[PDB]
C-alpha cells in the first residue's frame, strides 16, 4: 500500500493471529490476556491500527 | 460365564465403559449370585414379580 | 536413560507402559501387570534367572 508498485495475489490461507509469549510458570498470564480483551472493545486497538 | 467373567476381569474388559449382555440362561434363579458378576449386567429374563 | 533419550529423538517413538516385577512368579502382581501388553518390541532386562 505504501510503496505503490506491488500487488497481493490470493486472499488467505492458514489464518492465525499474533500473541505475547510468556513462560508457563509466570503470574502475569491471567492479568495480561484479560487486559487485552478489555482493550479490544473500547475502540483502542482499532484507533491505534488506524493511526 | 462366571469363569469367563472372572478371567476377563484381570485383562480389563469390565471397566467403567463396558456393558455385558447375557440371555436368561445365566440369570439363574435370581436369588443366588456369586462374587464374580459385575454391576450393570443387563439380562432379559422371564417375569417373576409382576404377576 | 531410555526415558531421556526417547524424549529428545527426532523420530517420534511411542512410549507404552513401563512395568516392574518386584517379586518374580508371584502370580499376584506379575500376571495382572504382564497381561496388558499391546506392543511387539518387548525389551526385557533381567540377569539370567528372572
Amino acid at each position: 500500500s505504501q510503496k505503490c508498485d506491488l500487488v497481493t495475489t490470493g486472499e488467505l490461507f492458514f489464518r492465525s493471529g499474533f500473541g505475547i509469549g510468556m513462560r508457563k510458570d509466570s503470574p502475569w498470564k491471567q492479568n495480561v490476556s484479560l487486559s487485552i480483551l478489555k482493550s479490544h472493545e473500547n475502540g483502542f486497538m482499532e484507533d491505534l491500527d488506524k493511526t | 460365564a462366571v469363569l469367563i467373567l472372572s478371567e476377563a476381569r484381570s485383562l480389563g474388559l469390565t471397566g467403567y465403559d463396558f456393558f455385558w449382555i447375557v440371555p436368561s440362561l445365566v440369570s439363574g434363579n435370581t436369588e443366588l449370585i456369586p462374587k464374580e458378576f459385575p454391576s450393570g449386567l443387563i439380562s432379559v429374563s422371564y417375569d417373576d414379580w409382576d404377576y | 536413560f531410555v526415558k531421556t533419550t526417547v524424549d529428545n529423538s527426532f523420530v517420534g517413538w511411542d512410549m507404552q507402559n513401563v512395568i516392574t516385577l518386584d517379586t518374580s512368579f508371584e502370580d499376584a502382581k506379575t500376571q495382572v501387570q504382564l497381561k496388558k501388553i499391546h506392543s511387539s518390541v518387548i525389551l526385557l532386562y533381567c540377569s539370567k534367572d528372572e
Partner: protein, 50 residues
C-alpha cells in the same frame, strides 16, 4: 441479571456440564468466570442494510 446467569454460561458455572460448544463469543465480563480456548473463527460486529 440479579447476580445470576441463565443458559450455557449459567449451566457451566454451577457445575452441571463441563463444556459449552456452539455460537458463543469472547467477552471481558464473560472470561472472568470461565476460561475459553483458542478462538478458531473471526467474529465481531457489522452493519447490514437492504
Amino acid at each position: 441479571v440479579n447476580n445470576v446467569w441463565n443458559g450455557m454460561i449459567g449451566e457451566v458455572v454451577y457445575q452441571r456440564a463441563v463444556m459449552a460448544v456452539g455460537s458463543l463469543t469472547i467477552n471481558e465480563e464473560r472470561s472472568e468466570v470461565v476460561d475459553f480456548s483458542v478462538p478458531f473463527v473471526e467474529t465481531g460486529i457489522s452493519v447490514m442494510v437492504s
